[PDB]
């Protein structure tokens, strides 16, 4: 035996260490066959449109269109005001603003108090 490899989100499990590939059953082989069949049908359609001498443009990709549409225009109709969504929206959209406001307000209050007290030493400060 040897020390174990532990996968993570950003360092995934290697293919050759998966228990899944070594559990072969007829349903698994059938699923692999159908996956290869789908990929081969798509490849045949693409190459048929690709090798055509009469085609003179972009081969339109429905998968890319679906990707861009889902990323951009399908978000709001599928939005639902949810405790998770509401809390994350409020946090990520308001908390930074108030955090930065507090920081800058404290900094400028300290600076203003110092300049009123005269102990700031602003010599040679001509450009603002």
């Amino acid at each position: 035996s040897f020390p174990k490899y532990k996968p993570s989100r950003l360092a995934t499990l290697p293919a050759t260490l998966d228990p899944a590939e070594y559990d072969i059953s007829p349903e698994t082989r059938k699923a692999q066959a159908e996956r290869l069949a789908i990929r081969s049908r798509l490849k045949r359609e693409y190459l048929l449109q690709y090798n055509d001498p009469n085609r003179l443009g972009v081969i339109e990709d429905p998968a890319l269109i679906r990707w861009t549409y889902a990323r951009s225009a399908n978000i709001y109709p599928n939005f639902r005001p949810t405790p998770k969504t509401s809390l994350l929206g409020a946090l990520f959209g308001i908390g930074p603003l108030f955090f930065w406001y507090y920081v800058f307000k404290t900094d400028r209050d300290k600076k203003e108090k110092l300049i009123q007290e005269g102990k700031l030493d602003q010599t040679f400060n001509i450009s603002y």
Binding site: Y5, L17, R29, Q32, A33, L36, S40, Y50, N51, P53
Partner: protein
């Protein structure tokens, strides 16, 4: 690369892949030639010990301990051929690869130079224009109903036939176009 993939890898394919990978990483560890030869003979003797095994369940229990051992001792910086997918010149010359259709957009003054080349080019284009209309029918009649099951293409079976979908394989730019 050139050959089409299958739905799955068999057991002996997995064993041979592990053998090649282990020997490559062993020679990465064993820099010198004689040391590598010695330890490679040891590795081969270790592989062929279970060569005649008939219990497939026990054989699959094997190769799993073997791949775990490989991952433990896999030389985190293996040697890679420079043009291989991890090498130092893997995609170095892709910026010099230009498609063949770009020549269609050359100015006539540019095509005035190299007249023989362009004449051969229209020869090729006519060949493609006829062969394609024949190839579509050939592929249509040869393909099982319900779509292809494997992404393998048939050869030319008649006399004047050309292999279907041959154009973009035959007219590859070059390995070193410039």
């Amino acid at each position: 690369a050139f050959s089409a993939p299958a739905a799955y890898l068999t057991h002996q394919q997995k064993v041979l892949r592990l053998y090649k990978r282990a020997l490559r990483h062993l020679e990465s560890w064993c820099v010198h030639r004689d040391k590598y030869r010695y330890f490679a003979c040891l590795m081969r003797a270790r592989f062929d010990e279970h060569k005649n095994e008939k219990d497939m369940v026990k054989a699959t229990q094997l190769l799993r301990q073997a791949e775990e051992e490989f991952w433990y001792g896999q030389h985190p910086q293996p040697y890679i051929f420079p043009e291989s997918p991890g090498g130092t010149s893997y995609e170095r010359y892709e910026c010099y690869k230009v498609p063949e259709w770009c020549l269609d957009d050359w100015h006539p003054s540019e095509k005035a130079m190299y007249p023989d080349y362009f004449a051969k080019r229209e020869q090729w284009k006519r060949l493609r224009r006829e062969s394609w209309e024949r190839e579509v029918k050939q592929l249509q009649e040869e393909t099982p109903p319900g779509g292809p099951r494997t992404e393998a293409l048939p050869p030319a079976r008649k006399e004047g036939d050309l292999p279907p979908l041959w154009w973009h394989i035959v007219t590859r730019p070059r390995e070193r176009p410039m």
